[PDB]
Design a protein around this nucleic acid. Structure first.
Ligand SMILES: Nc1ncnc2c1ncn2[C@@H]1O[C@H](COP(=O)(O)OP(=O)(O)OP(=O)(O)O)[C@@H](O)[C@H]1O
Ligand SMILES: Nc1ncnc2c1ncn2[C@@H]1O[C@H](COP(=O)(O)OP(=O)(O)O)[C@@H](O)[C@H]1O
Ligand SMILES: Nc1ncnc2c1ncn2[C@@H]1O[C@H](COP(=O)(O)OP(=O)(O)O)[C@@H](O)[C@H]1O
Ligand SMILES: [Mg+2]
Ligand SMILES: [Mg+2]
Ligand SMILES: [Mg+2]
Ligand SMILES: [Zn+2]
Lengths: 366, 694, 232
DNA sequence: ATGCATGCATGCGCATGCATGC
DNA sequence: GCATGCATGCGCATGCATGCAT
């Protein structure tokens, strides 16, 4: 089943659905959640009357399926000479840490910490398994809280536009059945098929949730279960199944009173349960300062963007190159050196010592 | 085709003779007749199945191995006939016991996964691996059906029951009628039938795609060989030739595929236990064995060991019932690894049920009657408490429960039974189980200034049920934090894809399980040698001084708990009678648990007053280390408060430690300086200045 | 699935633990083509068991008369009530006379007067109150033990519903309703819910419970002695 | 004579309205 | 002042039983 894209939607119209049939080797491709171009014919299948001296429907047959916009050794072999040259040029630059920050967020002024956190979340870690049967998380989740209009929702949209596999939800617009998955019958056999939810479509990707406080308690419990076990279990309609959801969550939230209280802790400012709160790796807090120079700087950028629609951007690397580099880099599984162990131990000791009573109270314990 | 050549009688007889010769003459690498001993072992258990390795068959006769994948049914029938003939030649009585024998292939060249099964594999032999998701149970299917005529009483001859089409008898030979017929239940032969749904392993599924499932059928001895949720490997036949497989009523002409499987792949101990019990440090080894991956928390491990070993229920007549289960409650700050203990206990325990009070638990905590979503049958599903009868029930997030769960737990802990009155069903079910629960404080951090009851959302009657209460705090100790960080980093490094305790040696898990089973089965301690006077005096003094303090007096209940713990200790050493050591240990544990729940001033006063009982089998070095830690903490706090930052070195005079030791009646500290604990905490002693440096 | 014939009907109430001896058979209803979505099963007949046997898991009058004719029956009965618990002789006597109970009397006017006794106990924890309740529940011929808020899967008072499929008035037996002429022990008297608290007033006073819903009005009988425990 | 459309539960998914508890 | 627990209507699909039009 295929769906009409958003770019072709006319005024006040809902996207149309079409049915495609694949034969022989073309059966292998065309996985769910993809954006693909199909080549084939339009053929009528029965679903006025005839007599001796009529209900029909439209079905599409496809011949080839291709990506709309197109194992380290295999990736190296697939890439062309110029693509590999560009990848090598990118790899040998320190400014890659800085330039990418300007590459993905050109219009946004300041907030470099959020950009670096988003980059680290995008790159992700290395998952591991223990000998006792337990599993260790390798994904990174990021939460943002701030005053109104402090560029809070722009990062989620940028991740939407950049990431190829990303699903975005807001508040109560997504139901419980919208997430997780659903099970329905097969139309031509005794088998059953599974309709994937938002989390499953964003598998090995990034899931963006705005207005995280408005979500219902049951939905938050389901999200916490997905974050913790990284598995979705469905026992419905005579079907029992378990599915893998290895996603990374980027969430946006607002204070209870609508403004961040400087004299209160983080727990007293957000109406979020402690379990889901503890699972997040990084929390970012944005406060709108009443500074004249900051207002001038923001105004300059906004007016420059509005004055020059497309000439106010000086990206160093195209988004396609960044996507290719990310795809190449995510395959690597670096190890931990011996001296890094002692360095991490000492740094964690210092971080714990920071929690002493000789300094003012912090908003989040370690 | 291969099947066409196989069908005719000539090659059938030739293959039969060849397989008989192969069965008779096959030997192992050492020359021993494999089939002789295999058939003898099968005979010893009156089995009905035989296992044949494909590698040996290919090595001996290549033609049978070549024809095997492309013609499974007929060749398997021929092999069954040959095996039956050979077995009947070996033993003649089996015509009375078993009239047929099945031949199953064990090994095969590994075949593609469930995704690659396509048209090329039609009517062939395949090997797959998957995970079981459902089971239909055992069902009876017809075989050699005998029919009874409706007009006359003639019994029709047996008809072979094919799995492709239903049996349709032609007509009665005598009366020549062709009307309806009925099945002769008394003389018909029946076979076992089972159906399974198999899904790909989630770990091997590539990202961006969903696992796929297929159906399989088991017959005869293969039934009830796989539990749901287990990982299996099957060798089977990829089949379509069954009636109703083709979609004809509407839609495209689509066939449904079904796999027919024929193979599934998944005294001295007593003396050893008695010898281990003779060891002088068996109890310490058992205590250190629990939770190898969890650092510290020795008291928690000891309490969990006592709970696991358990006690002995009593019932004088049928009036006064006293339980013997030791319930455990842990309350702690976040990040103290409370869930790891529960997971380890679930792994160790033979019958353990794990549940969480937050919600969406796999196993519920309240009984209800409902139609099961999978089996679609009207069932009565009891709570985790009933399913854990004579077992262990672990509860996580104990403070997030609702009213129904709280009421059910209260009635299961007080009355040890659950009463159900729903949908016209009135039942009472036993819930004899040991409860271990984990919880967090109300404010997110434990406050020593308040009592244990005020720091937990639970009510006093619920807390009163638990025999052992543990309190875990997250105080900042640099050495402990450094050691924990080292352990965590080492654990992370070791498990990349590409001995610290005073105990001599922890026991292996299997030996621990055998010890627990033996102790539970064959140990029943008796209290014929108890000393009532000491217990009575201690109880009187405890009550008097608790009321002198004026907060939370002790009661009779604790004494009973103490007795239980004593019995538990007597179960560890396999002693048939309790002695003074177990009584003293139980007294120490109970007093520690009671004291830890009081507030600051009361706890300090009780600890000062009751130093005699709490020091049973303790180490003076540990007490001196505690004193030194208190002094160091005081000095560091003063330095941080005044100077505003920590200094590079910490120093403390020896005279204060000596004076405090004299207060505890200790006059020598050379052993403490030479003790391993002194070096472990990186303390040094300087006689040139009579100081202690850290 | 089980089939009972003739005199074997109504011998078993649902919820009982039974041992049944019978014949393992299959249903015979001629032949029919396989129908429905799934047609993999071929030649499968539903099975059942035909039940043939079910087991459920004057001289004494003189003995009782001799026991009651003694001058020391009161002391013997008092001692027989929980000999394990130390002290509380007056409490044991009160429990015994509660177990024996009084007599109910009707009047020509149609009014009724209660013949059952109700007791209340208050005290500090650790005074062995629950043990007495359990002993009373075991000793009494009919006895129910509750926790005030109902139970794991049964409420304290009855409820009435209407089945949409069959349009019949289904009543769920509560803890008070399940006992008639027996003793109901109630721990944690403080934590009672509002509706149950309101209903127990009428249950104690008139020994009846009146329930009115759409198209129905009923008055169930609850002649229960009440033994309650509570905390300070 | 045979295969199919329909009557009668029942699960599924959902939205909507009334009561209450913090 | 609002989110949630507890009925109840709405719309639907699915399964089991049977009764006869082509
Ligand atoms: N003593 C310890 N030794 C090893 N690892 C530890 C120890 N204490 C804590 N950890 C680690 O702390 C991490 C926190 O997760 P864990 O599930 O154990 O927390 P928890 O105490 O159950 O917390 P919560 O209060 O959130 O339920 C785990 O990965 C665990 O390995
Ligand atoms: N630091 C900033 N730099 C540039 N533009 C900003 C910045 N902060 C806010 N803006 C502008 O203000 C608007 C904020 O809207 P939005 O991000 O939706 O607010 P919120 O996400 O908090 O609801 C954006 O359109 C953005 O262009
Ligand atoms: N007077 C007594 N004689 C014998 N045992 C007692 C006495 N008082 C208390 N106990 C013991 O102490 C325990 C008290 O617990 P419990 O009766 O549940 O307290 P409560 O009912 O007040 O909550 C019982 O198990 C009982 O065996
Ligand atoms: Mg926004
Ligand atoms: Mg936990
Ligand atoms: Mg009690
Ligand atoms: Zn006949």
């Amino acid at each position: 089943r295929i769906q009409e894209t958003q770019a072709e939607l006319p005024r006040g119209s809902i996207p149309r659905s079409l049915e495609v049939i694949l034969r022989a080797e073309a059966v292998e491709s065309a996985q769910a959640g993809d954006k693909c171009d199909f080549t084939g014919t339009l053929i009528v299948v029965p679903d006025a009357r005839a007599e001796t001296n009529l209900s029909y429907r439209l079905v599409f047959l496809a011949c080839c399926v291709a990506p709309t916009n197109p194992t380290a050794e295999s990736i190296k072999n697939q890439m062309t000479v110029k693509e590999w040259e560009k990848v090598f040029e990118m790899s040998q630059d320190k400014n890659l840490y800085h330039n990418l920050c300007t590459s993905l967020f050109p219009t946004i002024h300041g907030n470099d910490e959020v950009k670096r956190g988003v980059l680290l979340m995008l790159f992700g870690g290395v998952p591991k398994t223990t000998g006792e049967g337990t599993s260790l998380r390798g994904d990174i989740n990021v939460c943002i809280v701030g005053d109104p209009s402090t560029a809070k929702s722009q990062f989620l949209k940028h991740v939407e536009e950049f990431s190829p596999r990303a699903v975005y939800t807001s508040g109560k617009a997504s139901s419980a059945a919208g997430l997780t998955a659903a099970v329905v019958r097969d139309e031509e056999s005794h088998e059953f098929v599974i309709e994937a939810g938002a989390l499953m479509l964003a598998d090995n990707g990034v899931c963006c949730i705005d207005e995280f406080d408005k979500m219902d308690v049951r939905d938050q419990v389901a999200i916490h279960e997905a974050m913790e076990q990284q598995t979705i279990s469905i026992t419905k309609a005579g079907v029992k199944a378990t599915l893998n959801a290895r996603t990374s969550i980027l969430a946006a939230a607002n204070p209870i009173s609508g403004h961040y209280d400087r004299s209160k802790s983080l727990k007293q400012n957000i109406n979020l349960s402690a379990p889901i709160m503890s699972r997040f790796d990084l929390f970012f807090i944005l406060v709108d300062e009443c500074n004249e120079v900051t207002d001038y700087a923001i105004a300059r950028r906004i007016v420059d963007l509005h004055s020059r629609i497309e000439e106010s951007i000086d990206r160093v690397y195209s988004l396609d190159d960044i996507r290719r580099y990310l795809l190449f880099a995510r395959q690597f599984k670096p190890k931990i050196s011996k001296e890094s162990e002692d360095f991490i131990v000492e740094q964690y000791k210092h971080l714990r010592q920071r929690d002493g009573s000789g300094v003012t109270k912090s908003s989040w314990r370690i | 085709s291969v099947r066409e050549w196989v069908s005719m009688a000539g090659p059938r007889l030739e293959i039969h003779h060849r397989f008989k010769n192969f069965l008779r003459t096959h030997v192992d690498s050492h020359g021993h007749n494999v089939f002789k001993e295999r058939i003898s072992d099968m005979c010893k258990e009156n089995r009905e199945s035989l296992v044949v390795n494909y590698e040996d068959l290919a090595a001996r006769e290549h033609v049978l191995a070549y024809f095997l994948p492309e013609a499974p049914a007929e060749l398997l029938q021929i092999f069954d006939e040959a095996a039956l003939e050979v077995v009947l030649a070996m033993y003649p009585k089996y015509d009375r016991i078993t009239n047929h024998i099945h031949v199953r292939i064990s090994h095969l060249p590994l075949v593609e996964e469930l995704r690659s099964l396509r048209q090329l594999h039609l009517n062939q032999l395949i090997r797959t691996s998957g995970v079981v998701t459902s089971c239909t149970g055992v069902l009876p299917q017809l075989s050699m059906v005998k029919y009874n005529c409706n007009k006359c009483n003639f019994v029709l001859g047996p008809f072979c029951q094919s799995q492709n089409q239903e049996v349709k008898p032609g007509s009665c030979p005598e009366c020549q009628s062709a009307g309806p017929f009925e099945v002769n239940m008394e003389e018909t032969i029946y076979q076992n039938y089972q159906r399974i749904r198999i899904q790909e392993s989630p770990g091997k599924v590539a990202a961006g795609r969903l696992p796929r499932s297929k159906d399989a059928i088991l017959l005869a001895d293969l039934v009830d060989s796989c539990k749901p949720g287990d990982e299996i490997e099957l060798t089977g036949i990829y089949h379509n030739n069954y009636d109703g497989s083709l979609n004809t009523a509407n839609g495209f002409p689509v066939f449904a595929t079904v796999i027919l499987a024929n193979h599934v792949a998944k005294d001295e101990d007593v003396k050893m236990i008695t010898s281990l019990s003779k060891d002088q440090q068996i109890g310490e080894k058992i205590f250190a064995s629990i939770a190898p991956s969890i650092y510290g928390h020795e008291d928690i491990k000891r309490g969990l060991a006592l709970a696991l070993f358990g006690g002995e229920p009593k019932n004088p007549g049928g009036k006064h019932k006293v339980r013997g289960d030791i319930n455990v409650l842990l309350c702690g700050d976040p990040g103290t690894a409370k869930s790891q203990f529960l997971k380890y206990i679930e792994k160790v325990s033979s019958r353990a049920i794990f549940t969480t009070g937050q919600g969406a638990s796999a196993v519920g905590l309240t009984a209800y009657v409902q139609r099961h979503p999978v089996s679609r049958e009207w069932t009565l599903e009891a709570g985790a408490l009933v399913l854990a009868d004579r077992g262990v029930c672990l509860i996580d997030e104990f403070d997030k429960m609702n009213d129904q769960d709280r009421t059910s737990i209260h009635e299961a802990m007080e009355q040890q039974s659950i009463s159900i009155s729903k949908a016209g069903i009135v039942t009472s079910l036993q819930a004899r189980c040991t409860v271990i629960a984990a919880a967090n404080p109300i404010g997110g951090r434990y406050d020593p200034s308040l009592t244990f009851s005020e720091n937990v959302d639970l009510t006093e009657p619920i807390i009163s049920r638990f025999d052992i209460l543990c309190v875990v705090r997250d105080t900042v100790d640099p050495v402990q934090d450094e050691m924990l960080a080292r352990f965590v980093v080492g654990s992370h490094v070791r498990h990349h894809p590409s001995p610290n305790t005073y105990g001599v040696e922890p026991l292996p898990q299997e030996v621990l399980k055998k010890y627990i089973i033996y102790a539970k089965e064959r140990v029943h301690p008796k209290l014929n040698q108890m000393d009532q006077d000491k217990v009575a005096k201690m109880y009187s003094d405890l009550r008097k001084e608790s009321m002198a303090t004026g907060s939370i007096p002790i009661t009779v209940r604790h004494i009973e708990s103490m007795i239980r713990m004593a019995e538990a200790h007597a179960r560890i050493h396999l002693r048939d009678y309790v002695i003074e050591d177990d009584v003293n240990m139980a007294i120490r544990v109970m007093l520690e648990s009671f004291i830890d729940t009081q507030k600051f001033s009361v706890m300090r006063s009780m600890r000062k007053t009751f130093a005699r009982y709490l020091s049973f089998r303790r180490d003076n070095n540990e007490l001196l280390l505690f004193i030194l830690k208190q002094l160091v903490a005081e000095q560091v706090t003063y330095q941080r408060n005044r100077f505003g930052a920590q200094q590079d070195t910490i120093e403390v005079p020896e005279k204060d430690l000596v004076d405090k030791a004299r207060q505890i009646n200790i006059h020598n500290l050379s052993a403490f300086y030479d003790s391993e604990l002194f070096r472990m905490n990186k303390f040094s002693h300087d006689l040139k200045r009579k100081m202690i440096l850290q | 699935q089980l089939y009972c014939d003739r005199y074997l009907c109504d011998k078993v109430v649902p919820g009982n633990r039974v041992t049944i001896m019978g014949i393992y058979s299959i249903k015979k209803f001629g032949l029919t083509t396989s129908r429905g979505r799934d047609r993999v099963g071929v030649g499968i007949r539903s099975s059942y068991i035909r039940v043939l046997g079910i087991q459920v898991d004057p001289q004494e009058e003189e003995e009782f008369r001799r026991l009651a004719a003694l001058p020391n029956v009161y002391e013997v009965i008092s001692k027989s009530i929980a000999p394990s618990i130390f002290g509380g002789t007056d409490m044991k006597k009160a429990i015994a006379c509660l177990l024996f109970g009084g007599s109910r009397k009707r009047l020509p006017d149609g009014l009724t007067r209660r013949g059952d006794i109700n007791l209340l106990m208050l005290g500090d924890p650790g005074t062995a109150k629950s043990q007495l309740l359990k002993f009373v529940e075991k000793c009494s011929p009919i006895g129910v033990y509750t926790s005030g808020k109902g139970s794991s899967a049964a409420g304290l008072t009855a409820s009435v519903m209407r089945d949409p499929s069959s349009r019949n008035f289904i009543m769920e037996g509560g803890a008070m309703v399940l006992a008639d002429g027996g003793v109901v022990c109630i721990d944690e008297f403080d934590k009672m819910r509002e509706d149950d608290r309101v209903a127990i007033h009428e249950a104690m006073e008139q020994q009846t419970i009146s329930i009115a819903k759409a198209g129905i009005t009923t008055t169930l009988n609850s002649r229960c002695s009440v033994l309650a425990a509570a905390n300070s």
